[PDB]
Structures are given as C-alpha cells and as structure tokens.
C-alpha cells in the first residue's frame, strides 16, 4: 500500500521482499494492490543487474 | 428504497458491461467486491449504526461514510440485490461467476479522529430490542463508552451475541446470492494484523 | 523515444470531471464517437468533457507528447445540448481561463456552405463542406433539441 | 445521455502526436483496481494498458461507496417532515393581438 507518493521507494522495496516470501511459500495467485498506485509510481518488473 | 429490485444506476452499469466484455475478449476472470459502507449524505437513517450516544459511525474521509448494521435485513437485501445485478451481466457473457463479501465488522472509533474517538458503535435501538426479545436479559449497564478500557464481566454475553450476529449476516448474504445464482463461488477478505493481534480484547471478541 | 503516433482528439483519450452529487461515465462506440451517460440530481450539477495536453493518467511507458500549439486546426462535431443556443467551451491558457461560445451551423443547399444560424448575435463566418464528414450512426431525432 | 459523434479534425497543423508503446513480458501477478479511482477514463484505456504491461488471468474490483447507487435530493421542512422534490414555473402570460 503506497499512499503519499513521496514514500514510494521504501514501501515498494518492502513489497519486493513480501513477494519473495510469498513465492517461497507457494501461493498460486498474487496481486499488486491497485491500478492507480502502480500507474502513478511507474512500477515495472526487471531482472536485477549483475555487478 | 426497499421496493426497487435493481439498486444500480445506468452509467455504472454500461461501464461495467463494456469492462466485462473487454475482460472476456482477453481470457480473464472477474471478482466483484461490494462492501457495507454507503455515503453518509444519501444513507437511510434507520440503517446507520449508532454510537453510545446518538451520533452515527462516520469514517476517515472528506465525504463521511456510514456502515450497515448487520442485524437489519433490508440493508442486506440491498447489498445482495446489487451483487445479483452485477452477476447477471457477468452471466450474460460466457463468464464464470465469482463474488466477494467485503468489509464486514462492527465499527469502532479507532480510525475516526475526534467526535467519538475510540467509541464502539454497538448500541442501536433495534439491535437492543432484538437482544431483549431473544435470550431475555437486558443490555449491560454503564455502557462501554471506550474501546481501550477495562471490561466488566457482565458485558461479555452481549459481545458474544453481537459476534454471532456478525457471523450470521455474511452467511445470510451468501445464501441469498447463491440461491439466486447457483455455481457462484463466495469468498471473504481476511486482514491478518488484527486476526493475530487485535487492537484490544473487545475487538477480538466482537469482530471475529 | 516515442515509437507510435496518436491522432489528436482521439475518442479513447478523453476524460470527464464533474462535481459531487452526480454520476457519469465515458464510453466510446465508434471510430469517431463516444457517449457520456449522466444522472442529474441538483442545480449545481456541472460536467466537463476534457482533452488534456499533459498526460497524467498513463504509465510512463504509455504516455504521449505534450504540444501546447493548436494553430490552424478545426474541429466539428454533433452534440445534444439542452440549450442549443447557449453552449460554451472553457479554454485554459497559463494566464487565465477563457470561455468561448459555440453557435450552431446549418447547411445552405443554395450556396453549399455551412452558414451559421443566429444571425443577430453570432459569428459571420461560413465554412466549406468537407469540414464535417459523417461515417458513424447519427444522433436519434428524439434526443436532439430543436433550435431556430 | 450526451452524444459526441463524428469528431473530424481538419486544418494544416500538427494533427498527430507521438506516443510510447512498450509491451513487456508476462509476470506471475494479476491486476486489481477500484471503481472510484477509474470512473474518469474510458474502459478501453485501463484494460489495454494493464494487458500490455503483462498482468494476466485475474481481476478483482471493489465497487465504490459513492457512485453505484441511485439517489435523490429534497427539501425537508423543519416543522413537519414534508419532502419537496419537484419544481414548477409560475407565470401569467397575456397575449396582445390585433392591429
């Protein structure tokens, strides 16, 4: 949940960690919370750099 | 309001028709959530929950909102009629039927800031009359007046009865919707922080 | 860099903003048209169908260019005003917000030009044919309001 | 219902704007939204944008508190609960005809 968009980075990093734990557990279906926040903050999914 | 079969207006219905058509073109599934709140300005007065005093529930929004009392049957009929209206248009296309019952609880004063902060909205004349009618007894004296306060032992029977009615309301809604539309798959929304660690004993025994 | 071109005044990219105490939505139905179902409840109801130069409602990978220059452009369309004679457009410049009145235009079979009605107080310009080209289904006659 | 039909842009300047369209590969997640946030945009924009970015197979929508129901407004007298919802025009035209 990302309100007050000046706090996007920390909350989205926490979302990454939570998604990692959920994937480890094995949940079939996972949702980002909202369309509005996702399109406002420009969230994209990419493989991390190797360096 | 109780007489009309369809409680959803035209622009939202056309928007939902085109939305569902688009979601059907690209293979996808739809789950619709209808909650208890209705706008405070347009809500009927008898359905609203009431505080220990006469003031209604309200909420933390610039336009305030009020919550349906679970004991009332007319409001549950309203909600289930809205869900059935949406599921009908979902059914007209070759789409499976799913629905969600969202946000059932007995409102507390925690989220509200001022004007009844931390004040439970239990006491309503109709619910109190129901408590007098069935199981006898009477409503507990010195009303709680504060959620974060010690609770005397003579008040717990009332809280347990309230929790049982809360459990019964969602079951009634599910039974209505599934009776009108078979093959629907009901569900709920469980938010874990209060399930594992409730705000207080009153909340844990009241809303779950 | 931009890799796709978008037509100006595309039916899919309009937005609607309105007061409280009203419900309305936007729905396209053709290559050049859209519909805005409405529900009115009070006097102060006021709705606006807007085309915004700056793209704010799109993801950063789907936004479009912002060119504030509208020079030598003509837009003609059909509508359903409740008061056809008094129809206005709110054009907003950085300095101020202006209001411009739109007057109805009617075809003249003898001269073959779109000449305005409202002779007493109106624009005195006449436009050629081919300004308005109709390819979608027209507005039903029952919904339209009669003027002049 | 308001109709805006046959929008025809003609002239001699800058008829086309540029746009970005970068589809992305699929991920495991699925999209969920709310009605009060998305009543502004056309239903096509949201769906095509969400499908383009890779969200698949699930949607859950929470209908807002404020818009889905019907409603009315009325005056309520303080002395007696009488509701006035309709309006009327009172006027007395008189026609002068002749020479």
Curated annotation (Swiss-Prot), chain D:
Source domain of life: Viruses
TM region(s), chain numbering: none
Subcellular location: Virion
Function: Assembles to form the non-contractile sheath that surrounds the tail tube. Allows viral attachment to the host by binding the bacterial outer membrane protein NfrA.
Other facts: It is uncommon for short-tailed phages to have a tail tube inside a non-contractile sheath.
Subunit structure: Interacts with host NfrA receptor; this interaction is essential for viral adsorption to the host.
Name of the protein described by the UniProt record: Non-contractile tail sheath
Gene responsible for this protein: 65
Full-protein interval shown: 347 to 445 of 1382
């Amino acid at each position: 949940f990302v309100l007050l968009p000046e706090d996007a980075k920390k909350i989205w990093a926490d979302v990454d960690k939570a998604w990692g734990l959920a994937l480890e557990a094995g949940i079939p279906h996972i949702y980002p919370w909202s369309y509005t926040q996702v399109m406002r903050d420009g969230v994209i999914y990419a493989v991390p750099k190797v360096c | 309001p109780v007489s009309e079969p369809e409680p959803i207006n035209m622009p939202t219905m056309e928007f939902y028709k085109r939305f569902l058509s688009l979601l059907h073109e690209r293979d996808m599934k739809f789950v619709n959530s209808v909650a208890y709140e209705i706008l405070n300005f347009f809500m009927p007065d008898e359905w609203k929950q009431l505080n220990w005093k006469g003031d209604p529930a309200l909420s933390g929004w610039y336009p305030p909102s009020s919550f349906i009392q679970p004991t009332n049957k007319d409001a549950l009929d309203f909600v289930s009629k809205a869900q059935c209206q949406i599921l009908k248009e979902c059914q007209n296309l070759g789409m499976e039927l799913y629905f969600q019952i969202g946000e059932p609880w007995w409102w507390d004063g925690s989220y509200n800031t001022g004007e009844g902060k931390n004040a439970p909205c239990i006491y309503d004349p109709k619910t109190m009359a129901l408590y007098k009618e069935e199981t006898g007894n009477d409503v507990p004296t010195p009303w709680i007046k504060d959620i974060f306060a010690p609770v005397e032992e003579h008040q717990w029977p009332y809280v347990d009865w309230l929790c049982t009615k809360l459990g019964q309301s969602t079951n009634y809604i599910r039974d209505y919707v599934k009776g009108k539309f078979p093959d629907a798959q009901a569900t709920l929304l469980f938010f874990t922080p209060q399930i594992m660690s409730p705000a207080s004993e009153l909340t844990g025994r009241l809303n779950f | 860099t931009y890799n796709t071109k978008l037509n100006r005044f595309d039916p899919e990219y309009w937005v609607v903003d309105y007061n409280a105490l009203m419900v309305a939505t936007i729905i396209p139905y053709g290559s050049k048209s859209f519909k805005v179902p409405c529900q009115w409840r009070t006097n102060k109801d006021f709705l606006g169908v807007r085309w915004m130069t700056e793209d704010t409602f799109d993801h950063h990978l789907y936004r479009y260019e912002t060119d504030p220059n509208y020079l030598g452009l003509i837009l003609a369309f059909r509508h359903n005003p409740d008061e056809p004679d008094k129809f206005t457009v709110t054009i907003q410049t950085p300095e101020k917000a202006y209001t411009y009145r739109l007057a109805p235009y009617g075809f003249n079979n003898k001269t073959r030009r779109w000449e305005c009605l409202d002779t007493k107080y109106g624009t005195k310009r006449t436009y050629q044919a081919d300004i308005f080209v109709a390819t979608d289904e027209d507005i039903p006659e029952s919904e339209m309001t009669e003027v002049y | 219902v308001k109709w805006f039909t046959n929008l025809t842009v003609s002239g001699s300047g800058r008829k086309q704007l540029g746009q970005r369209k970068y589809p992305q590969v699929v991920m495991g997640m699925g999209m969920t939204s709310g009605f009060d946030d998305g009543y502004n945009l056309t239903p096509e924009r949201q769906v095509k944008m969400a499908y383009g970015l890779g969200y698949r197979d699930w949607w859950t929508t929470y209908i807002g508190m404020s818009h889905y129901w019907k409603g009315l407004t009325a005056f309520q007298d303080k002395e007696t609960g009488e509701l006035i919802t309709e309006q009327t025009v009172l006027d007395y035209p008189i026609l002068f005809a002749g020479e």
